A paper describes a structure:
The pneumococcus acquires Mn2+ via the PsaBCA permease, which comprises the ATP-binding cassette (ABC) transporter, PsaBC, and a cell-surface solute-binding protein (SBP), PsaA. However, our recent studies showed that the functional specificity of the Psa permease in Mn2+ acquisition arose not from the specificity of Mn2+ binding by PsaA, but instead resulted from the concerted action of protein metal ion coordination chemistry and structural rearrangements that prevented release of other divalent transition metal ions, such as Zn2+, into the permease, despite their ability to bind to PsaA8.
We further analysed the metal-binding site coordination geometry by use of an Asp280 variant isoform (PsaA-D280N), as it would be incapable of facilitating the trigonal-bipyramidal coordination observed in wild-type PsaA8. The structure of PsaA-D280N bound to Cd2+, refined to 1.7 Å resolution, revealed a partially solvated Cd ion loosely interacting with residue Glu205. The C-terminal lobe of PsaA showed minor movement (~1.0° relative to the open, metal-free conformation), but the inability of Cd2+ to ligate to residue Asp280 prevented further conformational changes.
Numbering used by the authors: 32 to 309
The structure:
Amino acid sequence: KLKVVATNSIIADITKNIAGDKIDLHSIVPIGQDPHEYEPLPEDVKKTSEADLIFYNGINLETGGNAWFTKLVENAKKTENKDYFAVSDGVDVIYLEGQNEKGKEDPHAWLNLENGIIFAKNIAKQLSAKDPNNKEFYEKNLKEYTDKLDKLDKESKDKFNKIPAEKKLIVTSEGAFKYFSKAYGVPSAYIWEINTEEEGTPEQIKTLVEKLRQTKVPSLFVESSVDDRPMKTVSQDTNIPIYAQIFTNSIAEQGKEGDSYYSMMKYNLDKIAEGLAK
């Protein structure tokens, strides 16, 4: 079978929904770990060296900081846009501090569903190019999968559009929800910016408290993958409850709620639409 490597569980899950058992699939970053600044293990090196097709997020997720993915493909003698492909190719990129420069792309594109669809379309295209025998199969799965994502996307947009606008603010610890904000029409507020060295300092917490005091936002949220003590402090200091934990950069373990890209997103969308309507 085609040997495929995905850098993280979101990409791997989307890939599974396109390819089913037609491929040999290895995922590098395990469920619940952070795909930024990961350390590949020997099995990852072996699988990537053997791979026919390699998918990564791109837009600086795996190539910033320690640039682990770059090191991995260079050692594996794999070539950009021949062996390995950024599944974010084609997304409408957001830049940190709104400054369009290479390296300032915000990586968190999958947190709106239109980009999950783009991810899937890129995955299907490259599976089909490397394994034409199964092209019809990949394309059928692509349509089914992207239909599923599109329905959820439209339903969620309809819900957000109904919420009184004074309540519409997505508050999280890290500013990782800017693509979500763009797509669903819900402005972002947060304790610390992407790629900040110190997470959850007194300066940062105070800043967010002072902003939220002037708002009517009814719920805050917290990422399952961050230390929740800064947001708990913000919650206490503003008297705004934390409604839910939400997913950011990983699906959940198999069998749990959110154990696929689709169900991860449905959980997020469901909890945030619920929480902001309070």
